[PDB]
Amino acid sequence: SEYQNIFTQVQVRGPTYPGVPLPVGNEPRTGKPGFNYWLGKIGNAQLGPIYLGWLGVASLLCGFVAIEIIGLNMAASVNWSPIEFIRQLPWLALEPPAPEYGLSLPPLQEGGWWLMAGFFLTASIILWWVRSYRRAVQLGMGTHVAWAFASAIWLYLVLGFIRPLLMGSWAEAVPFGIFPHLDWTAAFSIRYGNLFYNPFHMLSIAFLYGSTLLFAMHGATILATSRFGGEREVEQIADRGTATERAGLFWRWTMGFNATMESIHRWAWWFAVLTTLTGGIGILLTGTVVDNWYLWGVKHGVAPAYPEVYPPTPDPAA
Amino acid sequence: ALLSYERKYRVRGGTLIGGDLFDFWIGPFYVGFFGVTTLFFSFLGTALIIYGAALGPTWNVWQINIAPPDLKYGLGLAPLMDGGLWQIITICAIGAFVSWALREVEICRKLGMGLHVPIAFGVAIFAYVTLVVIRPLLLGAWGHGFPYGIMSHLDWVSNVGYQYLHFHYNPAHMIAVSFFFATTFALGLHGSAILSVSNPHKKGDPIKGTEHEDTFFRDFMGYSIGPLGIHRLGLFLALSAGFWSAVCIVISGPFWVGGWPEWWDWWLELPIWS
Amino acid sequence: GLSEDEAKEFHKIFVQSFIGFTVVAIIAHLLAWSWRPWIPGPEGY
Amino acid sequence: METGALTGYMDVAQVTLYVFWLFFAGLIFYLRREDRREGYPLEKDDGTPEDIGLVWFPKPKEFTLPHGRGTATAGRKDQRKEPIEKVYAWEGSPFEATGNPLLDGVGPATWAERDDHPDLTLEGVNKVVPLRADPDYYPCDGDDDPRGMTVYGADGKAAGTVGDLWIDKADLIVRYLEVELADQPKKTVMVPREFMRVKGPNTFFNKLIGLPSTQPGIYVSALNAEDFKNIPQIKGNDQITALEEEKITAYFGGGRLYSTKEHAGPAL
Amino acid sequence: MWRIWMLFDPRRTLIALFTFLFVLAIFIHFILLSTERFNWLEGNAME
Amino acid sequence: MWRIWMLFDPRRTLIALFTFLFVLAIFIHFILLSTERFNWLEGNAME
Amino acid sequence: MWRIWMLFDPRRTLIALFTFLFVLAIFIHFILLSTERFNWLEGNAME
């Protein structure tokens, strides 16, 4: 039995790191950093500090308003019963506006609250995105986080804003609930003929599978070479060590090709962003330009034809 | 044929079976004994799939379908053109997947690496054998496995999902999806983090170390897991996604037959709020 | 880390502004009651 | 025309799919170019370079290092003479060490020519330091302190005792164990954290339940106790160089094949 | 009972107690609002 | 009661109190809007 | 009351206050647009 580098056996404690000095024009960091023993078992023990600039407080306030609108509406749906609130929490939702209103502003009685929560949640997410951009720039680091985040926002925006805008109805958008938004997801595929046959849904799943596959490969590869300092990836990129060589050689000998320490994270970055990028395009296509994906599959020779175990059933409604 | 740093590592030993006889390379690929068995099972399985494609109605890549036998055949071997070919390919696939994992073990030993990658691949193999062996075994028929076709097995997923009227309500499926979503979210963050420090915002800027990596996430989300933690967590999320996927499909049918939303009535009928 | 003198001074301002908040709220509640009282009674409004 | 239709059979979804196929093909081509920034150009088993063209092999990537360390070029070619000989003549054959592969840096014991300077924090001081050089850092309470425990080899024989802990300043974690050798020619030896297992009464399932450890200590299954004496020695005190880190960790990596020989030869 | 403050830190105890009391008060108000009899805003008739 | 500020930091107490007060005010306004009698925007008749 | 700036940074408070006021103003304008009576764009008849 050898050490598998799953949990840190010996943690050390010292002064907390306050972060690299930010350039002038930045707010002071908030919070007093502390050490969490159980977090240090897996990774860094230090919790905080956090940066709360104008973007952070504005995004928190906008997100707080959206959550409060959702939560108070779900609480009101169970007659303000906290017992029924907890019991029915996965089933409750802030329902999207009724289809009769189209894109017009709906009353509070028929989905006006959903539009406000969607607006404030979108503002919170957008303000969080620029904060992700700003925090990277202020440290001098590249803005890879912000643009990977933009891909996730892209699917979020098409799901609740862009596609309902194209369909001309806020009713096409996702309810703010746990089970109801699963119902919407199931109903969306059912309405547009088996979203399995959406080729961009296929692509999104391939990248979602690939992203999970890549992190399984990359996480295991780095842990298997962490005995040679493989976890210090940026140091390996600048100054290649035997950990990078062993990591590349393992995959070169396995599947005939390999990446570098830097380029594997380019594979990781692109596979993740392509999951939501392809997914957002696929969602944007259905209802606007394709209305039955299975029939699109049979039109393009995608859907298999199965042998008839029963005679074809005539539609009794003529 | 060799990377500029590859020559020193191309040494003997580390094999499990065969030892010296199969210890060589063909181009970039290491062979080993399990590489030969991987090639044997891969060629046999691929050839039988192509043969089933040739004997099928169409050569359309999306429409090629090697279906499992009928449920009436139970756990026995069906005729080759009535699902028996699928059964043979399934054995070849399992032989190829296990040989591939064992080949990775030999390469890991030869390089002094840990066995994390073959173990992580074992979770993927476990999900496949759950879909193709364990769940059909618990249901009593090999015809419960998914067919071998690019689009036919997607139809299988849809029909199995709707065999429980709402597969989103499956509790283990809910956990598995969240892990799949979490590992992609973590992968995007981790790839972005490493690229951000190795590719600074201003071109030709000093490269950033782990302090900037920690500081950005502490500035951004208030916590940084560190370079070691993200690979531990990323592997954990990916393996949890694979593991809970096997759980979610193995409990559908063998241990739950009704609609998945029915299952949540235990929570609604708890004596604290009944 | 507040000394006793500053603690008294904060409390003096805190109490005064708390009264101002409460007095404005009291007026708001008196106006609300004159509009629509919120205690039903046996018949229930 | 139908709303999605383009040419009777062509529709918007189909051409959008083909647009992505073009982009994906370009992305895969771009990603493979990034994969070739290290390890290329390829060379034959005898060292003769292979032909790479230009559309695949990208221009060298120059990283400007911090702390005034200059600039680093990806694809550094190691200059040490390889003490290996091809077992057979045909390409793809393994290579046999013309000496002791454990000390020569061959196979699992291979070490790359990393920088001969210590890793530095952003402030500019050494990242990896012993606990004797910085009392501001200490082992965390609730975790067994390796300092004092005896280090056992793979064969179960005692190899020495921990004398100090080398920690990373950036990430508050133990990086190396300074082991005072039980056998002396005070010769100290560095054991990387990932190559050792702590078996004290505070690890887990022992602090949770309260069970004392039967045989507490540091257990190293990578090397036998006899091979601990040959672990590469750091040149200086209170400072470990990145090249010295590589050689120590490469020596442990080759131990399972060359020291204990449990990976040497087939299992069955 | 005055010696409990040698064990409990008065600052953290007051923070936990004040937070607990408000959450309980909101919990109880919300419970009554859900009931037909004690919903003072809906004004359902008694008996 | 001035001694409460020897324990509680006046700054974080004011931040907590103000955030506390706004949430409660938003709660009550939302609850009144959810009722028929006290929804001033919709203005249902009394009795 | 001028001592409120001894405790809170005038710049940071002004940023927080202006953010709060605009969010509340948008919230109230949005709520009115979600009412039959007070939607000045829809222009429903009074009473």
Add this chain to the structure above:
Amino acid sequence: CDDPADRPPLDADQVGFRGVAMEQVKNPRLEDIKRAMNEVPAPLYPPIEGDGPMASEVYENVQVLGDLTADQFTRLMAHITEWVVPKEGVPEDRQGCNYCHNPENLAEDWPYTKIVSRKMMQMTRDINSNWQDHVNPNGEGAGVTCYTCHRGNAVPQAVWFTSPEDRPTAVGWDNGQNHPTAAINYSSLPEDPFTEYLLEDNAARVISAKALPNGNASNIMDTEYVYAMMTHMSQGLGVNCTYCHNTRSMAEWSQSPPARAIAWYGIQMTRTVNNNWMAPLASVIPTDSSDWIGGTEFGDRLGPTGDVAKVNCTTCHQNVFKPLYGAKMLKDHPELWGEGDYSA
């Protein structure tokens, strides 16, 4: 998990092509319980196929059983007492076959149950005659008796009322969904698809007929109503979606099992009986809820909106793919054959 628990061994019937996963895996132990629950009671005595005085001549107040021989008329009276009148919890004055009758004179329609029973006599014969496309699919169907939808209870255990319209509130709008409802499998799907499809004439179809968009106005919210209705149909028949659909091509009738066509007739027939036989009962059933036999103990005769308890697929399938597992109970009771032939 359930009682009996779902575990190996299990039964599986395959309806579609191999590998399409068009199958139903069910608990054999739960099936044995259901088969015991759906056992058909034996007839009291064989049918009186002989002739004799007509019922309308012997008895004065006969409106619907006018074609019955006086011996057939008495046989039906005895059987419907076993099928509708529960022998447990009935008030003393309504026990036996006094449940629908004044003991002093039987020609008096004093209890509301007698007037209701007259309507159900016409409804049962109308189902058995004009809706054979569902209950007698090709001349070998089981048909329907009073026991089929009553099962010995005064009120069928599976009924549905129109969901009362929620109060228009500025906060907490739920759109008739977002609450766990047992009828739709404890999901968040719309709680009342029954009024949408089993009361008014709405086709539960949302899927477009062509690959590219055209004049299809169905939105996601109204497919959730279809989804809720189909969840009830699957739950009410104890089957899954693949019993009637190849879910990859859900709208394709050419890929659907023949059970889907029969289920379509069930939707039309259930809608018709709800509109022509169940809804008009509101003028007959007393609204006081104290004039109901046994009070509310046997169940609510009316809903919150004052509507009659309407008929579901679950009403008299009762979680079985065929009522009473397809047992031919109506064959032994020719009195309830309106115009269809259910012999053998």
